[PDB]
Design an enzyme around this catalytic site. Sequence first.
Site, short mmCIF file in Angstrom:
data_model
loop_
_atom_site.label_atom_id
_atom_site.label_comp_id
_atom_site.label_asym_id
_atom_site.label_seq_id
_atom_site.Cartn_x
_atom_site.Cartn_y
_atom_site.Cartn_z
N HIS A 139 -9.72 0.38 4.98
CA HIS A 139 -8.53 0.60 5.38
C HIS A 139 -8.15 1.64 6.50
CE1 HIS A 139 -3.81 2.75 5.72
NE2 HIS A 139 -4.09 1.12 5.51
N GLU A 180 -5.57 -4.43 10.66
CA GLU A 180 -4.88 -3.55 11.03
C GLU A 180 -4.31 -3.31 12.92
OE1 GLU A 180 -4.40 -0.48 8.00
OE2 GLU A 180 -6.41 -0.82 7.83
N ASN A 219 0.89 -1.48 0.08
CA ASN A 219 -0.14 -0.28 -0.11
C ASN A 219 0.87 1.24 -0.05
OD1 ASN A 219 -1.77 1.72 0.05
ND2 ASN A 219 -2.58 1.34 2.54
#
Lengths: 228, 246
Positions: free
Chosen positions: A92, A152, A8
């Site tokens: 995200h 994450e 990313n």
Amino acid sequence: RKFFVGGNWKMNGRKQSLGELIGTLNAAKVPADTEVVCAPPTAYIDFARQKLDPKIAVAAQNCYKVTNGAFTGEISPGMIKDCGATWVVLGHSERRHVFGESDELIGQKVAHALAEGLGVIACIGEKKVVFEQTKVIADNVKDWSKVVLAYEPVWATPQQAQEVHEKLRGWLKSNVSDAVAQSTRIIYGGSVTGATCKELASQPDVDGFLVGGASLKPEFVDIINAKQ
Amino acid sequence: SRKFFVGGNWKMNGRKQSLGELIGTLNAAKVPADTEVVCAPPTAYIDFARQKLDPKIAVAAQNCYKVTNGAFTGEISPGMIKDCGATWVVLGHSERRHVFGESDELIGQKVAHALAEGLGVIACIGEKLDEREAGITEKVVFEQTKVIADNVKDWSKVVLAYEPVWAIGTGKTATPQQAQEVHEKLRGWLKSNVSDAVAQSTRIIYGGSVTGATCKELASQPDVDGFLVGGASLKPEFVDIINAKQ
């Protein structure tokens, strides 16, 4: 489960620096058993797909939830596919926390992207909540073949990662199916460097990475080779 | 002596094939020398459109973020926009404000960064139906303009776009008289708050519904300096709108 390494790039790079990044990736040998995906800034999806050898897939960093419309500043899965990209990153931590994207919205984006024939890297992470996020995604996934889950620990060890990933797979097992839990890649989206990737990749429930800052660097090649 | 300005906001529409055809029509079009033309493609097609569009037509991004690089997955910066050959960015569009909840504060920060980075800015303002119906048009557009102005030190690369959001799918419609009324008050705000020179030279373009059939009368209004065109910008009638001052 095939090892999956996504890079990313976030909001970084220009044609010059990204071109050199891509040239380095083209010159590398990626192990056939590794699936490699790069997610450029939206302005460079088309650029990146043109320069990158086809062995490496391209992902958009975000998309919206209808195929066309009056949404100035957004792009649809159809445009992403039209540019030759085959994945989109959805949910995200930065979209959820800086841009306030709700779980409902992320669920709708997931359903539309999959309907349009894109693969989805669906991201979850905390600040109970991780399971809530995953449920919303699962409620919008009928076929898990083209989805990858990325965890994450935005709050931030391999043991810590393995712990959560194992719980995540357990959630899939109890709430979707044994087959989905066994086949779905769950990749780690926390801090990963060339120096740390090998021990993380060795964790049995860690299936790869969504790499941040290191994806801009030569050491991304080492992260690709983490199982090697 | 303000140069007539016609921007085409493609919004989230089109693919390479359909946009390539749109672009072919524009390259071939008859356009007058006294009109500055700008096209704003979906973000994935900024590069594509700049490569295919004749250089006499400028490209705008539909949005950007407020720093040059960083951890903002899904965003792009003015530096990237310039790097793709685009010279403008549309900021504060009603859709960003209302669908994606962009604050005045954020929009001002974006304006300041884009201008610093060398981009022109098409800065959008406008009041909603409930605000218009509440009789608060002035209050709303003046506050939005103030945030923009507080973040502009050189107006030479700014264009203000007024969007009568109150007239979008609300049934309600704005007359050219109503458009002119708002543009005149916005120019008056510039004169009262910035300077005579800035009020005189700054283009204020109309961002409400414009068609080939409506553009000439709107363009004739003394304080309307052009258009930010929505849907029509995807059609051949965009060429008629480019020629509205005609």
